[PDB]
């Protein structure tokens, strides 16, 4: 499925890897390589972190298809209920299904916020 | 000249390359280097076929300057008509001049259908 | 502080820099390393100068947090007004705050006409 949604810019990260900014939504789609896990988060009309400072937070690499104790789900000694589809997406209202870009580059994959 | 549509956004192939994909005219931008020969397709709203996929048949390089079997001009050993300019383009309406953003990264150069 | 206006797409030159043509306001987004200086100019409707002639005055490096004898500060031996912020920027109405795109890559960095 599809929606209309597609109007955001595309930007880069250092030398590697990329990453795109939603001037609207205020969406951010970032992953490692083509085709994996991917990761949405929101940003602010009032100062965008350009690349400038998303390399600043994706230097220290806290997912890498693992997700660190960044969400409420830690992976590591946790009570039964978790997080990403219990924690860090209270149902289809999760900012997983608000723009088509995203879905994308990410590979309509599931992402969980960073 | 020039026109009245540039509503598309730029994406990246891989590590080595880069198109562009249009989220509207359902069209998009791949060459090889800098000004040089460029190619345009057509997408589905349903699923559009991100990086992912592009690199797939990207990765199969049938083009480079010289254009596979892929369209009705296979190049060699051919009836007098070909195509091109004469099979995959029907005059002026080919998808060749519906968009000003491929007009950039293309160079204004004849692109064919691959 | 931020604006209504992120309506541009985002382009790279050669294989080591990236810039971004704004379709409309006619500004482009150009620096060396992420976070630095920025340096912004502007293009024709008739025939936007893709990447493909960025590169080709680019390729000469004539800034690099310096900024070469273009402007009309040439930074040597000159007048006691100089240009930039009394040359090269008519008070706020200088091309430096009618981008909110141009903002984020740069970051709000004072760049200066090339």
Same mark, same amino acid.
């Given at each position: *499925?599809?929606?209309? +949604?597609?109007?955001? =810019?595309?930007?880069?990260?250092? @030398?590697? *890897?990329?990453?795109?900014?939603?001037? #609207?939504? +205020?969406? %951010? =789609?970032?992953?490692? $390589? !083509?085709?994996?896990?991917?990761?949405?988060?929101?940003?602010?009309?009032?100062?965008?972190? @350009? /690349? &400038?400072?998303?390399?600043?937070?994706?230097?220290?690499? #806290?997912?890498?298809?693992? /997700? #660190? =104790?960044?969400? $409420?789900? !830690?992976?590591?000694? +946790?009570?039964?209920?978790?997080?990403?589809?219990? *924690? @860090?997406? !209270?149902?289809?209202?999760?900012?997983?299904? +608000?723009?088509? =870009?995203? @879905?994308? /580059?990410?590979? &309509?994959?599931?992402?969980?916020? %960073?």
């Amino acid at each position: *499925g599809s929606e209309h +949604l597609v109007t955001t =810019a595309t930007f880069s990260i250092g @030398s590697t *890897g990329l990453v795109v900014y939603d001037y #609207q939504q +205020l969406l %951010i =789609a970032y992953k490692p $390589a !083509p085709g994996t896990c991917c990761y949405i988060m929101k940003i602010a009309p009032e100062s965008i972190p @350009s /690349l &400038e400072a998303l390399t600043r937070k994706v230097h220290n690499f #806290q997912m890498e298809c693992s /997700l #660190q =104790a960044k969400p $409420a789900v !830690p992976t590591s000694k +946790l009570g039964q209920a978790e997080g990403r589809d219990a *924690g @860090s997406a !209270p149902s289809g209202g999760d900012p997983a299904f +608000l723009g088509m =870009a995203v @879905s994308t /580059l990410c590979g &309509e994959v599931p992402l969980y916020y %960073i």
